[PDB]
Amino acid sequence: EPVYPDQLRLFSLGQGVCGDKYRPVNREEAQSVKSNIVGMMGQWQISGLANGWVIMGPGYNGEIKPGTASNTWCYPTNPVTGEIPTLSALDIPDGDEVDVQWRLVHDSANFIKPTSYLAHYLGYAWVGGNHSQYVGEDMDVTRDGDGWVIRGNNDGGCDGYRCGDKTAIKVSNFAYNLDPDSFKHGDVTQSDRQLVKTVVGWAVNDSDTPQSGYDVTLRGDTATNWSKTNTYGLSEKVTTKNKFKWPLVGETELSIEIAANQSWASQNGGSTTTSLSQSVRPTVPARSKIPVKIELYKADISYPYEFKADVSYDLTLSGFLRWGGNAWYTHPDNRPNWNHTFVIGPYKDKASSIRYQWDKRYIPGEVKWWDWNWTIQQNGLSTMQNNLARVLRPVRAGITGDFSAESQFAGNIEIGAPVPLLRLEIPLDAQELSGLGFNNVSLSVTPAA
Amino acid sequence: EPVYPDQLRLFSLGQGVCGDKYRPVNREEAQSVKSNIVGMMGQWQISGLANGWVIMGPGYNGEIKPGTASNTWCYPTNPVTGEIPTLSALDIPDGDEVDVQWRLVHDSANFIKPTSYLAHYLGYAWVGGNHSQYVGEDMDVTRDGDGWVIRGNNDGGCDGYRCGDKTAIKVSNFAYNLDPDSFKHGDVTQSDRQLVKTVVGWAVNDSDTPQSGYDVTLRGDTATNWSKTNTYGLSEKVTTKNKFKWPLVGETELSIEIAANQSWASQNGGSTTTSLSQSVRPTVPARSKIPVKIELYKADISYPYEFKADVSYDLTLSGFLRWGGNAWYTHPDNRPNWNHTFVIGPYKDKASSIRYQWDKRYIPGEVKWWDWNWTIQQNGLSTMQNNLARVLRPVRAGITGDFSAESQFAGNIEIGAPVPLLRLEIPLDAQELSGLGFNNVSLSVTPAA
C-alpha cells in the first residue's frame, strides 16, 4: 500500500482540510515520498500534513515539523492501485541505425517475448510459431521496408480455428531523441589554461565631489574553434527537442550551442564568435583614482564524450481477436481482424498510450479502447504490471565521439583601492590585442541607466 | 521581469481563482518556464492558467491548450525580485579527501575570489594579501585541522588602520551525500545469462467444469554474490541519506541495497539470499491439462561505476568590520572584530542561510543579521547576484569504482495451449535443484483472489 507520488494533490481549504474524496498525508507517508513532495513546492512554501504537522519547501531542506497551514497535501481515500513500475533503461550499444534496430528487434527476452505476451493478454490469437506450445516463441523476424514484422512461424501445418492466421507485431516509425542530461566524458586528453595578458589602468575622479552613477563597460569579441567526431552512423538521425549549451569541464570555459530539430552529425564543429560584456559601476571618492584590471585568457580542452538518445517507436498488433477471450471494450466474439497501434514513447493521444488507458482504467468514460481492468481479472494485477513494465521499459542508444575546443575570453573587470589624485587612463593597443585574438575591444565610461 | 518558478503557488478554488494576494499566471509567462511548472505537476495533472487557458502535467508532455480546471497556478502580486541565479554544478573528480578539498578551496576563480568578494561586500576588512591591490589575491590557503583557512598574506609591512589584521575565510565541516540518481556505468565488462535449467510439467484440470480462479506459485531461495571496489578514500566519509536498490543494468536481475548513514567504503560486498515468487493464473478448460514452464537462470555482470556526492561545508568569515562601510544590520562603526558562519549546502537555520536572508530582505522583522538591501545599494543588484551565485554554486564530487554481481533467478511461469486429457504434475528434484544453488523451492496451488 505504498503512496504513489503522482496521485498526491495539494489543496487550499483550511487547516487540515482536503478536497472532496481525498484525505491528509501523514508525516510517516510524507517521509517515504519526501523527495517527490518537496519537488512540487515553492522554495519557501509551507504545506500542511495530518495531525498538526507540516512539510517545508526545498529552501528548508524539506523539513517536516509541528505546525499549521491553510493548504494541505492530500491523497486519495480510494487510491488507484497497481501502477506500472518504471524499470531502468535498456542501454543499446552505439552503432549504425540498423545495428541498433537489429539488436532490439531480435531480443527475445527483452522485446519479442514481452510484446508478444502483451498481444496475447489483449486477446490476439495465435501469437507464436507452430513449433512451440508457448507464446512468443519460434517467431520469424522479417524486415518490411522501414519497420520490422514479428510473426509466429507457419512452416508445416497448424491445428486450431484459423490457427494459420498468426498475429503480426509490427515495429516501425523509429526516432532517437538525444538526452542532454545524460552527458558524460572520459579522461580529459588535452587541458591547459594560459593568461595571455592583463589590461591595467585607472579611472579618475578629478572633482571635489565623489562619483558613482557611471558604468564602466568593456566590449569586444573573441572566438571559439571547436570540433566533435561521431564514431557511428546513428548520429545522422538523432535530434534534440530544444537547443542547449555544451557542458563545462575543468576550468576553461566555452560558448557552444547545439541546435534543436537538426541532426547531430550535421553539427560537427566550427568557429563561433563571442561578445565581451562586463560593466562595473565603481564609486570613486573626489580627487582620486582606482586601479582597474582585466585578465585575458586562452584555454583548450579535449575529451571523449557520450550522451544517451532515447529510442521511441510505434508498436502495431494485428491479427484476429479470440472468441470469449478478448480485451477490447465492446468484447466482440465475431473474430474481428483487429489492427491496433500503441506508441512507445512520448504521449501522442489517449488511444496510443498504454500508460494513459491503464491509469484511467477506472473512469468508465475513459475506457474507450482496451479494457485494462479485464486483463487484470483474467491474469492478475501482478502479471499485468510486470508484463507492461517490460514493454514500456526505456530503451536507450549511446551516442559517442570526440570533443575538442579552443577559446579565448576575458576575466572580470576588477577595481582596487582608491588612491589620492569619471575618466579612464588605461592604454589599449587595438593592434596588439587583435593579434592575440581579441577584436573591437573598447572601454566606455557612460552615465548609469 | 521574469516569473520565478519557485514563487508559484497552486490554489484549489475554481477556474481562475487564486488565493488572496496572488494572481493567475498567464500563457506567455507559463511558456517561459514551462519546464519548471510541468516539473512541479503530477503526471496526469491539469492545472488552470489565466483566461480559460490550461497547462497539463508531464504525462501529457506538459501541453498548453484552452481548457478549464478547478485548481489554479498562481503568482504573487508582489514577488520578491532579483533571485540569486542558480549556476551549473561544479564537478570535481574523485580522489582522496584532502585532494578533493584542495581542488575546491585552492580554486581562485570558483572559490577564493568569490568568497573573498563576499567578505569584502559584507564589510570585512583587508581581504587580500599585501602583494595585491585587488581583493581576493595573494591569498595563503592553510590546513586548519580538518578545514582550511584562506587569509591574506602578511609578508612585509602594510599601510592602513590595523591592516595586519587580515580577514580569514575558514572552510570546514565537509559533508558528502551520494546521489543514487547520479549513477553512471562504463563499458559492461563481463555480462551473460546462462539458462542453467528449465523445469517442465503440466497442470491438470481433473474436472468437466472448466477450472479457473486458482493461481500456481513457485517459491524458493537462491543467492546473489556481489563485490565492489572504491578507487579513492573520499569514499570513507560519504553516505546516502536514505537506502536504495542498486540499479539494474542489462538483463541480469539483482537484489542489492545500500544502507543509509553507513560509509560507502564499508559496504563493499557480501552474499545476500534472495527469494523467488512467481505466479500465473491458468484458466484450464474441461478435462484438460496445460504445459507449464519455468526457466532458471544464472547471470553475472561487471562494469566500472560512478555516482556523485554533493559537497557541503560551513563558511566562516571573521575579521573586523570596516568603518563607514559595513553591512551588519545594526551597522557598527567601532570596528568590532566580527565572526560569522554561513552553511553552504542544505538549509540549517536562518542566521546561516544566504538564500533565506536574501529572499526575505524586504520583510523588516526578518532582517536580523546581514543587511542585504544595503549591499545592493552599495554594489548594484546585478553585481550582488553574480557574486552570491558563484558562492552558492552546487559542488559535486564524483565517486568511482568497480562493481560485479553474480545471481540466479527464475523467469516467469509460462503456460501453454490447453490439451485434451487443480493438481500439478511438474516434478521437482530437490537435490538437483539444491545442487545448482536453488533451495527451498516448491510449487503451491491456491485460490486466485
DSSP-assigned states of every residue in B78-91: SPPPSPPP----EE
Q: Which residues contact A18 (CB under 8 A, 6 or more apart)?
A: A11, A24, A72, A74
What are the residues facing A426 on neighbouring strands?
none
Q: Report the alpha-carbon distance of residue A433 to residue A442 in Å, rounded.
A: 11
**Grid cell of B432 as nine digits:** 538437483
CA distances from B70 to A68, A91, B98, B171 (A): 24, 41, 55, 50
Q: Report the alpha-carbon distance of residue B178 to residue B242 in Å, rounded.
A: 10
Q: Assess contact for B240 and B258: CB atoms under 8 A.
A: yes
Q: Assess contact for A376 and A370: CB atoms under 8 A.
A: no
One-letter-per-residue 3-state SS of B321-387: ECCCCCCECCCCCCCCEEEEEEEECCCCCCCCCHHHHHHCCCCHHHCCCECHHHHHHHHCHHHHHHH
Q: Assess contact for A368 and A349: CB atoms under 8 A.
A: no
What phi, psi does A270 have (nearest 5°)? 130, 180
Can you give the length of chain B in residues? 449
C-alpha dihedral sign at B36, B42, B46, B50: negative
Helices A113-122 and A372-379 cross at an angle (nearest 10°) of 100
Q: Assess contact for B278 and B218: CB atoms under 8 A.
A: yes
Beta-carbon contacts below 8 Å between A and B: 118
Question: B43, B216, B361, B393: best mutation site toward chain A, by most A Cβ within 10 Å?
Answer: B43
The 8-class DSSP code of residue A248 comes to P
User: Which residues of chain A lie closer than 8 angstroms to B280, CB-CB?
Assistant: 379-380, 383
The answer to whether A134 faces chain B, any CB pair under 8 Å, is yes
Q: Which residues contact A252 (CB under 8 A, 6 or more apart)?
A: A191, A193, A299, A300, A301, A405, A407
Q: Which of A204, A199, A229 minimizes the C-alpha distance to A430? A: A199
Fold designation for A1-89: Pertussis Toxin; Chain B, domain 1 (3.10.40)
Q: Which residues of A49-66 are buried (b: 16+ CB within 10 A; e: fewer)?
A: bbeebbbbbbbbebbbee
Q: Assess contact for B294 and B222: CB atoms under 8 A.
A: no
The amino acid occupying position A397 is A
Task: Pinpoint the residues of chain A covered by CATH 3.10.40.10.
Answer: 1-89
Helix, strand, coil percentages (3-state) for chain B, rounded to 5, are: 20, 40, 40
The 8-class DSSP code of residue B436 comes to T
Q: Assess contact for A225 and A405: CB atoms under 8 A.
A: yes
Q: Report the alpha-carbon distance of residue A201 to residue A413 in Å, rounded.
A: 11
Q: Assess contact for A62 and A37: CB atoms under 8 A.
A: yes
**Method for this entry:** X-ray
Contact A380 B215 (CB under 8 A): yes
Q: Report the alpha-carbon distance of residue A130 to residue A159 in Å, rounded.
A: 9
What are the residues facing B298 on neighbouring strands?
B194, B408
Task: Pinpoint the residues of chain A covered by CATH 3.30.412.10.
Answer: 90-175+310-396
Q: What is the CA radius of gyration of chain A?
A: 32
The answer to whether B46 faces chain A, any CB pair under 8 Å, is no
Query: CA torsion angle for B140, B143, B149, B151 (degrees, to 10)?
Result: -20
C-beta neighbour count of A38 within 10 angstroms: 21
User: Which residues of chain A lie closer than 8 angstroms to B110, CB-CB?
Assistant: 251
CATH architecture of A90-175+310-396: 2-Layer Sandwich (3.30)
Q: Which of A376, A312, A345 minimizes the C-alpha distance to A83? A: A376
- Which of A:416-435 have CB within 8 Å of B? 416-417
Contact B133 A281 (CB under 8 A): no
C-beta neighbour count of B237 within 10 angstroms: 15
Task: Pinpoint the residues of chain B covered by CATH 2.170.15.10.
Answer: 176-309+397-449
Helices B381-392 and B113-122 cross at an angle (nearest 10°) of 130
CA B214 from chain center: how many Å? 43
Query: In what helix (H) or strand (E) does residue B221 lie, and over which residues does it extend?
Result: strand B214-230
Q: What is the CATH number of domain A176-309+397-449?
A: 2.170.15.10
Q: What value, to the nearest 5°, has the Cα angle with vertex A211 and ends A209 and A213? A: 140
Provide the H-helix boundaries in A20-144.
Answer: 27-32, 34-38, 97-105, 113-122
Left, alpha or beta for B156 (phi > 0: left; psi -120 to 50: alpha)?
left
Q: Assess contact for B274 and B160: CB atoms under 8 A.
A: no
Q: State this model's resolution in angstroms.
A: 2.9
HSE-CB of A62 using CA atoms within 13 angstroms? 14
Q: Assess contact for B55 and B30: CB atoms under 8 A.
A: yes
Burial of A15 (0-12, 13-18, 19+ CB in 10 A): exposed
User: Which residues of chain B lie closer than 8 angstroms to A59, CB-CB?
Assistant: 6, 347, 355-356, 359
CA distances from B386 to A213, B6, B117, B381, B391 (A): 20, 19, 11, 9, 9
Strand segments (E) across B60-185: 64-66, 71-76, 90-92, 139-144, 147-152, 168-178, 184-185
Q: Report the alpha-carbon distance of residue B335 to residue B328 in Å, rounded.
A: 12
Q: Report the alpha-carbon distance of residue B355 to residue A59 in Å, rounded.
A: 8
CA distances from B164 to B125, B140, B320, B322 (A): 10, 14, 11, 14
Q: Which of A220, A250, A249 minimizes the C-alpha distance to A413? A: A220
Q: Report the alpha-carbon distance of residue B206 to residue B211 in Å, rounded.
A: 9
Q: Which of B163, B169, B276, B263 minimizes the C-alpha distance to B218? A: B276
Measured between its terminal Cα atoms, the distance across chain A in Å is: 60
Q: Report the alpha-carbon distance of residue B279 to residue A240 in Å, rounded.
A: 42
CA distances from B355 to A448, B76, B224, B274, B391 (A): 28, 19, 46, 46, 11
Can you give the length of chain A in residues? 449
What are the residues facing A443 on neighbouring strands?
A218
Location of C-alpha cell 557612460 = A446
